């Protein structure tokens, strides 16, 4: 999972094993790298199941998305963020899980 470069203008990224449980203690990243000027809308499709908490924001596990200075997330829980219009050509999706949990992960489809 660590060393995903995406060079095509549309595509689809998922948590390892999605929709099986994603592995524990996992520092997985995903890069979308396209020519500057391309503009990337990210959509979460299907089931967003990242481990969550009732009272405290997204400890444990989480997807973060970084472009330029802009940083979306960290996200977790059973409901995915609304589509993200990054207005960027180069996004780092970072996903991170701790050492326990039984969540099935996430799935996004990008396009530019
Ligand atoms: Ca976990």
Go through the chain and tell me how many residues it has: 112
Whether omega before 74 lies within 30 degrees of 0, making that bond cis, reads yes
Which domain, by its residues, includes 96?
1-112
Which experimental approach was used here?
X-ray
Does 100 show up as a binding residue in the annotation? yes
CA–centroid distance, 27 to ligand 1, in Å, is 12
Distance 39 CA to ligand 1 centre (A): 32
CA of 61 to the centre of ligand 1 (A): 5
Tell me if 79 sits within 8 A of 46, measured CB to CB.
no
Resolution (A): 2.7
Q: CA-CA distance, 5 to 57, in Å (whole number)?
A: 29
Q: Is 35 exposed, middle or buried (0-12, 13-18, 19+ CB in 10 A)?
A: exposed
Distance 33 CA to ligand 1 centre (A): 28
In DSSP notation, the chain reads ----EE-SSEEEEE-TTTTSPPPSSEEEEEEEE--BTB--EEEE-S--BB---SSSSS-SSEEEEE-SS-EEEEE-BSSPPP-EE---SEEEEEEEE-S-----B-EEEEE-
> What is the CATH classification number for the domain harbouring 1?
2.60.120.290
Confirm or deny that 61 is annotated as ligand binding.
yes
Q: What string of DSSP letters covers 57-86?
A: SS-SSEEEEE-SS-EEEEE-BSSPPP-EE-
Phi, then psi, of 105 in degrees rounded to 5: 100, -135
- Asked if residues 98 and 62 have their Cβ atoms less than 8 Å apart, the reply is no
Residue 106 in contact with residue 50, Cβ under 8 Å? yes
Q: How far is the CA of 18 from the centre of ligand 1 (A)?
A: 14
**99-102 LR contacts (CB < 8 Å, sep 24+):** 99/24, 99/25, 100/24, 101/21, 101/24, 101/51, 101/60, 101/61, 102/21
51 annotated as belonging to a binding site for a ligand? yes
Q: End-to-end CA distance of the chain, in Å?
A: 23
Q: How many domains does the chain have?
A: 1
């Amino acid at each position: 999972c660590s060393g995903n470069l995406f060079t095509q203008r549309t595509g689809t990224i998922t948590s390892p094993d999605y929709p099986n449980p994603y592995p524990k203690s996992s520092e997985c990243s995903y890069t979308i790298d396209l020519e500057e000027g391309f503009m990337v809308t990210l959509q979460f499709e299907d089931i967003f199941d990242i481990e969550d908490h009732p009272e405290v924001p997204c400890p444990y596990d989480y997807i973060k998305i970084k472009a330029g200075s802009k940083v979306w997330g960290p996200f977790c829980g059973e409901k995915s963020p609304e589509p993200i219009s990054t207005q960027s050509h180069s996004i780092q999706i970072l996903f991170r899980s701790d050492n326990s949990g039984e969540n099935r992960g996430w799935r996004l489809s990008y396009r530019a």
